[model samples]
Target: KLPPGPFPLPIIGNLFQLELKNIPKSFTRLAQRFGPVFTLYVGSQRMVVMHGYKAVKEALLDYKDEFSGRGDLPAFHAHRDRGIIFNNGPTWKDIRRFSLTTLRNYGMGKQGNESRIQREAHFLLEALRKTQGQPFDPTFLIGCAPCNVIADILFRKHFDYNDEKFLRLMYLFNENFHLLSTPWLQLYNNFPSFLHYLPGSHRKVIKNVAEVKEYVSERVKEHHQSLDPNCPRDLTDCLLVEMEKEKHSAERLYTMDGITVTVADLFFAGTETTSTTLRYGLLILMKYPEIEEKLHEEIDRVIGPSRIPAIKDRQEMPYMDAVVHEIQRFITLVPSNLPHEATRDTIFRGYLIPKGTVVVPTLDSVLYDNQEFPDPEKFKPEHFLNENGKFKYSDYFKPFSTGKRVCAGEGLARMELFLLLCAILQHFNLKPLVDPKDIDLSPIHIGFGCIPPRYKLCVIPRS
Candidate 1:
């Protein structure tokens, strides 16, 4: 039998019963009433929402094969279910394997990507230095750092901050993510048949996606022309090399379309999450200068001012590591998480989950669990620290989520967050325009993402 939930009314489902703006909050309330696993309907779409660490971990990890299917996201219809994030079945397995292999070969978590990120961090510092200690919105500049890292990995090129095309691409990335978070996009996901015909943000998302695909397609053509099988330069070149090898195979796993979507997947998914985390991390530091002060002390004590921050230094700076971990746990970005589907009919925790059932794993429940993190509402690096002041690890600290479909770029993302934040802290002090007590740490938007409220800060040079 289907899990129990508040009864759904015809057509509208439970839309009115839940808080639309705060999906995770609303879901938490329901979980308190209905238990960790329960069913709910949105318009005609049925969903099984899972809450807390135990429930989420069990379903995603223990029965991972059954829950491996990528759930439907109508707003991303432009993706056509072709790449890693949206695709399913054997095709997904093959592409995911290829993408992971390619990413590692090109230095995803290793010294290669680390050096690239370190170099980009230098560029980021240069851009910030140009502000001349004046208050400025760091949104664009911070976004540019991670964007360029992905660009370099994807096409073996980096765009200058002032480059017109580069700025436009960044604008689209930010805009599209904002659009995805809007109530209008949620409406589309629920009632696509009706909303598809109407003009709204979803259309803009589709248009933006098409424009990005066109840009990626052009790059693919360029890379294909200069293809060097033995020496693959970037992700596109690697995929092109593989596409040629698979040309005669009946499976034909690597096609032009596949390569474009695969590259685009990395471009979209890789850029936003790490950059947003970095952005949020900076704001949190501003909100609590003492936390920032501790981070600075650690930075000076370990790496000092002369050398750039490296991945190895992360091992030495226990407090800095704790702070980063705490920020991710406190923010709980992508709180509701990307939906997962039941690949086959199976019984989970006494409930009969049928094939094709969409599952929602609420990450906030795990991150904010009072038992795991006391005073979960407040920002404290002590959440990740032990009595000995060592970096205490928690299995419940899962900002990257978990299981077979966990974030593919987890390695690269962790490296970027550590290196980029450390590099910035190494060279300067964050000076908020407003008083630290007055600075608001609450997220302005909380649906698709937990976005930090907009504010400006000046970076005072330490040297």
Candidate 2:
């Protein structure tokens, strides 16, 4: 009735069919059985899922707007209609423009952001060096590095490792995201009015949001007190300047409330996503010792030991560059992007999707599509390598989504991943404490996000 799909029950829809935790893997399984393009129903909502390169490209690029809508997902919609990630129309455009300009002004792409990343990487390296070849979790160190980068970008300050307030904020943000894609949470979002009265994950999510908002509010107040119009230090300062500049404009989009939300979004988005990928990247390196050895040789030859690697060094270290690209492909953080809604009626592959139709693009399929990548499962860096062994970019490899709605932080994220990975590998010979065969590569359920199963590794300094 609605495209090709596995059967769905009347009211519950495909609730039973959907794997609450590993939705991407579930979609992969479904794609295997039901072909690339299929229909899925969540309550009364009918979603068109485009799997693999052809299907995803057709919808995301060819019929871009048809699948460009952010839909009415409750967790996403709860953002008070602020920030770049959630809003649509002029609201989304204004926030995004302001965010990009502010980030750029504060050194997102230029030397400023690069120096910040290097500083954070140095902190991470020092922390890892303390491991002294002993087995350690390394997750917190990895997580904190990116968090500091985001903090530098937003608040213009880095948190000390023992800072209680910072620690609490990180934990709450992590917990909130970990519960974001759970079934009970999803159900609550679908029927918030009725579920608001029930006891479940929704309450925790609401509390988490409140805590985050309060924390951000305090920082906003501090920024206002220290506001220096002549010299803007970070993102908040930049936004303040923009707000003042547009104060007299008919369309004033930068408000104190909006700035707070934008700061929160940047912190959360930058911290969690980059940290998760680095964690998995380290794990993959430990799993494949030869790959690590090869990367170490490249880093040593190109970067040398005394000098910390930067984004520019990526060009000289081809193999190391490919490894980072492969890590993103292997991990595929966010297998399906946050659902997009068609802003207006559009067509894709002869199918006319109405303005309000919800579209979910399976980004994982594009990354792992057989046609684009011969062996999708294996961690093959050659997939990103040209015949000359130089890094090769693929149109099908849309890790950060595609089209106009692509992630604004993509450039910063790429720089962080490269610099962090190189920094760590340059100093340590990363290896799992347990036997290689005993290591588990299974996916852990972290609400909507997927975390690689827990594994400890020894970070012994290179002799």
Candidate 3:
């Protein structure tokens, strides 16, 4: 009943044809043989791989509810396992929708969240000025800056960079995601039977998650005592009010966990990738000084160094805007997006997909489509720029995934990238420790995330 795919062996299915870690790029290659819509097996589970921008858009947007199913995979299973993220069921639909509904109304693209991001951006520029062009690794540096803005949405709190607890909490999130991406964990996604036995370290992550949840819960508990029902401070306060107003229905549990899960998704889903993308963008800038110069010129011309870069300034700084967009596209974060599974059996493209089938949408296929992105392997800002020398929006922006299953913090992440990058560029100039020609622009790992090869650069304080 499934669509045409490579032959499968008894134990692994097409997994033998496509290795677990390399599914994204592998799916792109497989699509050439099987066509736009094709079936692939992860262990024994059947997933429909949607290649090209048109096919993916049609499946996710045009069909709407049809292809937008969730799963218990690396990026997804978090919510179901008490983090944030899950499959498409009536309960989850409302569960995630509750918080999403709140975010939709007030989160990014609003005055409050924008001010929060801008304030964080101001702090980031201040922190960078102290570096004095000394060579440093930016891996954790990026992580530290994100949470301050990220913290604003969850609950109103200030994160001290020196705070050991803050660093440890961020470490826990990265560690948990590392554990999930492991072969033992990912195998469960394909062969459901493997999930019965669990990992000991996996349970330890619960402690870390609980600490974060408790962190949010304690705040929620505190917000309850303050008792200013008229003025809801953050998302937790807003949701706490929702929790009280709604009659506790069976489907809408409205527990604190439901609210905390959304925060967890923002933590794992938004935090690391946003920072990594910036860190990687730095290396890309170093590699192409001309591109870096253009960004600086735009930042100077449109968003003068006399003031901080605002969201409105982003539109006028077309070169810098294209650079940020290109960095995300080139990195292709989460090559294979959050896993989706069928909630109901449906015939798609004349193929039968049974209920509860795990669907893996190969984002790499669309992100790196040959025609959409010429010389897909190269890093060129021109890809996002048109002949008119303006920022051109592309339909092929699937690096953050798409449709209902897309990352909830996308708008926040976009704001983070634009503000953070330009804010730093406004006052600093990045120079390499070695020859720019020697810089390796490859990712160290290429699964859910592609970590740029460990490298250091000097960010000098510009006059």
CA lDDT of each prediction against the hidden true structure? 0.86, 0.77, 0.72
For model 1, how does the per-residue alpha-carbon lDDT over 1-463 read when each residue is reduced to its tens digit?
A: 8887889999989887677678888999999899999999888878899998889999889988988987777877666568788875468887898789888877844458888998998899999899889989887888899999999889999899988888888788878777776678777877899889788878988888888888998999999998888988888898898889878888677778778887888897888888788888899999888888988998999988969999888889999899889988999889998888888998888888888888888899899989999999989899999999999999998887898888888888888898999989999999988888898888877778877788888999998
Q: Between prediction 2 and prediction 3, which has the larger TM-score?
A: 2
TM accuracy, model 3: 0.91
Q: How many residue pairs clash (N, CA or C atoms closer than 3 angstroms) in each of the candidate models, in the order given?
A: 0, 3, 2
Q: Which of candidates 1 and 2 reaches a greater lDDT?
A: 1
- C-alpha-based local distance difference test score of model 2: 0.77
Give the TM-score of each candidate.
0.98, 0.92, 0.91
Scored by Cα lDDT, where does model 3 land? 0.72
User: In model 1, which runs have C-alpha deviations exceeding 4 angstroms?
Assistant: 108-110
Residue 202 error, candidate 3, Å: 5.6
Q: Which ten residues in a row have the lowest lDDT in candidate 1?
A: 102-111
The residue pairs that clash in candidate 3, if any, are 79-84, 79-85
Error of 1 at 55 (Å): 0.4
Candidate 3 Cα misplacement greater than 4 A, ranges: 74-78, 81-84, 107-110, 177-185, 191-211, 225-227, 247-251
Among these predictions, the greatest lDDT belongs to 1
